[PDB]
Amino acid sequence: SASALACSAHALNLIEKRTLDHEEMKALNREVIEYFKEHVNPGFLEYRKSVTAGGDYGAVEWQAGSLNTLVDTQGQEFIDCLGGFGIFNVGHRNPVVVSAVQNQLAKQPLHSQELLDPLRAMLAKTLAALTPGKLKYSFFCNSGTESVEAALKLAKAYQSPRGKFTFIATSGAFHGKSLGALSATAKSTFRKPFMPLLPGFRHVPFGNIEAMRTALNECKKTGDDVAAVILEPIQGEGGVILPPPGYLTAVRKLCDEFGALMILDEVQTGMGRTGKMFACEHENVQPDILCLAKALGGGVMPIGATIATEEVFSVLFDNPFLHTTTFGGNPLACAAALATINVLLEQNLPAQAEQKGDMLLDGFRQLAREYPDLVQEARGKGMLMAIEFVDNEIGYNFASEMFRQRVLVAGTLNNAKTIRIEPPLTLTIEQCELVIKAARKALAAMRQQVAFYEILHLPNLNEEQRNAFIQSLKDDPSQSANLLAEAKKLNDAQA
Amino acid sequence: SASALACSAHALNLIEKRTLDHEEMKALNREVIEYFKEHVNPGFLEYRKSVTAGGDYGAVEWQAGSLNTLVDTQGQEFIDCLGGFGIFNVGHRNPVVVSAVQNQLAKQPLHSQELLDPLRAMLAKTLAALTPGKLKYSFFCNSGTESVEAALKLAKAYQSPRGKFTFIATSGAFHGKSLGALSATAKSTFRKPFMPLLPGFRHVPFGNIEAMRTALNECKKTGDDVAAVILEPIQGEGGVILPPPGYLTAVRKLCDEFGALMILDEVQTGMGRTGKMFACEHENVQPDILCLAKALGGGVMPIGATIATEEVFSVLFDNPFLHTTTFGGNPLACAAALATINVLLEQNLPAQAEQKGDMLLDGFRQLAREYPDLVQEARGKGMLMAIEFVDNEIGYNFASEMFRQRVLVAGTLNNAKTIRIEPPLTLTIEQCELVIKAARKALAAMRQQVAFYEILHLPNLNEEQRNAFIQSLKDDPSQSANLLAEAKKLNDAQA
Amino acid sequence: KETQEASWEIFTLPNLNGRQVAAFISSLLDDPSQSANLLAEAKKLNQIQAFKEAFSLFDKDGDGTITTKELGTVMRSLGQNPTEAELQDMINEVDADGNGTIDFPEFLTMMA
Ligand SMILES: [Ca+2]
Ligand SMILES: [Ca+2]
């Protein structure tokens, strides 16, 4: 058809463009839909259809608008309440992060892998200064799942000479999709097609200290002593699930008691999202191993970090090549990360995340009491929030209605009824009120919608008074509640 | 020591600097050695000590010099014959790749993960055009090990409903260090501390078609039918091991016969290094799954890609979230990759790699016959070469002596006697001659050294008869190999 | 193992000939214990030899002593313009024997 050279050349021509005319846009959207269908995954097209209405399923990314907005190929601007599921904590194209990445790009993007690269040392020192307690040594990779892999391998190298092999995770947990991390991840549909996974992985209910104590004690009784416990401080993909106060402290004490390592997965909750730099700081809990990614890249670079105490990390001192990764700790990613830490500390973005989080969650809870027919509950901590609906169809219509009002939201991998709100920490107060209002109009449209369907499906109604009923439903929406009652008032009287 | 804010600020000040005075340089080198010792890994410091002489163990990266040179914090320029173990196929800071990355950085670095990003579609289409046969669908991640993880998960999702679970790899293979990929990787020291790994992984000798046929037939007889065979077309970390002609074709035929999938790991051999775009093109072999990374990033970005036929990749169509990764397919990485494919095709860098590879390997083979006391053999294909020495200490002294002459080389993870030569495909002929001469002076110095030791351990000669020999060796270092001859010519007569 | 590393580090010193490196090698084979100290004074010895060389090239007429004009020649050559009094002060500061010229050690003392 065309050669790879032609395709690449076209792609670079399109990378160099800053805006698109209407016919260039139509051709590009048509192209991207085709190539998604034939070379990426057609399932994605169906998914976005299930969270949109009409051609909304075919919005194509183009450029960052401001710190908190994204602009598609048609110039439509969206407020980003998705934040790349926790990536854009410091907004899109943060000037400081973009600046650092450009400077280091001017010097050297990737390292030789042989000589000492200075930004890896600088970032390791910074992270040692920034992490609680004895967390001292850092290993750098490129993703969250890789960080969890490094955590598991550290735990294994430390505990295998001590006769401990089994790992305890929690139900509803998500720790990545690489096979190692996938053994810890808990969602059935993510795991079943790839079994068998790693042996000796067990799961207990999240937030239930007695269940976990039971698991450790039974594992000790049967000779399957636990090497490590891994958990998120707050389950992001589980639907923003908050553990009871003191749970993390009790888990730390339990691991200390049984001689198991505590691995905290802060891939999503880290870098200021929950109101503090790390969620474990809410209870002043120091794990043995801490996992970071996503937001640590500043929304510019991919990066992951596994920080551990010298006691545990020392298992790699005799053989520094025991665990490595091809691109880990490259100068570009390190520059991004240092820039992000600087931005978060200088603008005190964690505290801002607490304030704006409290405000948005207040709004969402008020909407929750006003719409109990659609919203089950709203929950969150800092700027990691979620709204759980009555069914999945309802939350679907919510995501769609918010997308039509140009506010970006998305579901949670382990919870089909829940929609997450994870906007940048730089979201302004004006945009906070705009998002609350958008949620209100969404819920209103959804209530009028369910009324419209219920009125449409009544079987004991001829066509004329149905046309009158939906006609009135359109012309006076605030009477929605009454007319629906009236509809059934008549649907019963001729049964 | 200091607060995280201070550390970050210092790091950004150092990122913005373009040159260093010597007190700046000395302070920075001292800093990076300290932070490597206390926050990264002290073992690395010891390793570089074993491959250097004096303060050469403490060379710190600073900036790319030219396409094929690296400049440390002291202004010393090195010819890069390491290429990041296959990363810098198109050189350091390739203007085209840097340009594309800069433009897309101006537009948007990371995607929302919800809307359609166009460069993912463009890159998937380009890779479909560039890959042999029915390879059609691409999954994008951030590293080689992640690409291998995606390959394994594709094979599992395809073969588990067909009752096949076991995987066959080869000894001496390297496929990554994440637990999934590590189950396929073959080096004992990399695997033992993290066992148990994935069940049902077996290894056969590389290049031995009858051994592999035996493994498949026995697995079928016992009901442990093989889901997939995974191998590198040429083993990189094994010491650049070349299979017999027709091996890849026979492996494809065998997989077709038993109904197993063929997974080709081209993380190292891909992107033109072996004289063609992919090593599998030497025999016109199309695998079911192809793994790419390293060089696909153009030496600017981290990226990985798993390409598969629609037949196998279709296992992700019903549920597009069955396998994902946080940063995979981000616009920066895609821009880098497209720029790299463009550069490779427009400058026909594969063919250049064949020519320059033939030249360098000719030089190395001539040095090999001139120095059989130190070199066992030199091997290679395209610009993926290696020199295997008699001992590990010998190859160590070679790496050190080449580093002293400001030519970068490094060892191979699975082969302690072998030093790899993996320079950029953009290496100039002048630099080819320079590296050949550097290798010559290295081997000369090493012969002088081994002679100097061997003269010291000869038993049958008096305490002063040696000192004449050492003396003559040092102030008149010309009688060298022939001198060692004299030494033994007296030792065996005095026996 | 370390006796060998010592043996090669002493062997590779640029400013020693075979006779002394060989003598030292003897001292090290007889004593693996007196290494890093023997190694230390050997390294130092290299420093003295190279210092000797440079000094020799600072004695233009090769007569083994350095005068104010030879000094002067080097000082003027390095872009400077010393006066007679400055040169005399420099020599006077280290002139242990008061003969007005610089011998071998006194030059080492100037450097110290
Ligand atoms: Ca004189
Ligand atoms: Ca005197």
Residue numbers in the entry:
A (entry chain A), B (entry chain B): 7 to 501
C (entry chain F): 107 to 218
The authors write:
Here, we propose a method for generating proteins and protein complexes with complicated shapes using fusions of alpha helices. To design amino acid sequences that can stabilize the alpha helical structure of the fusion sites, we superimposed one or two turns of terminal alpha helices of connecting proteins using a molecular graphics program. Then, the amino acid residues important for forming a fused helical structure were chosen from the two natural sequences in the superimposed region. Our method does not require complicated computer calculations for the design process and can be used for the assembly of artificial protein complexes with predictable and rigid structures.
The crystal structure of YgjG shows that it forms a homotetramer, with each monomeric subunit containing 460 amino acids. The protein A-ZpA963 heterodimer was chosen as the linker connecting YgjG and the target protein. ZpA963 is a variant of protein A that non-covalently binds to protein A with high affinity. As a test case, we used a calmodulin domain with molecular weight of ~10 kDa as the target protein. For protein assembly, the N-terminal helix of the protein A domain was connected to the C-terminal helix of YgjG by superimposing ten amino acids. ZpA963 and the calmodulin domain were also connected by a helix fusion by superimposing eight amino acids. The crystal structure and a binding assay using gel-filtration chromatography revealed that the complex forms a rigid hetero-octameric complex, as intended.
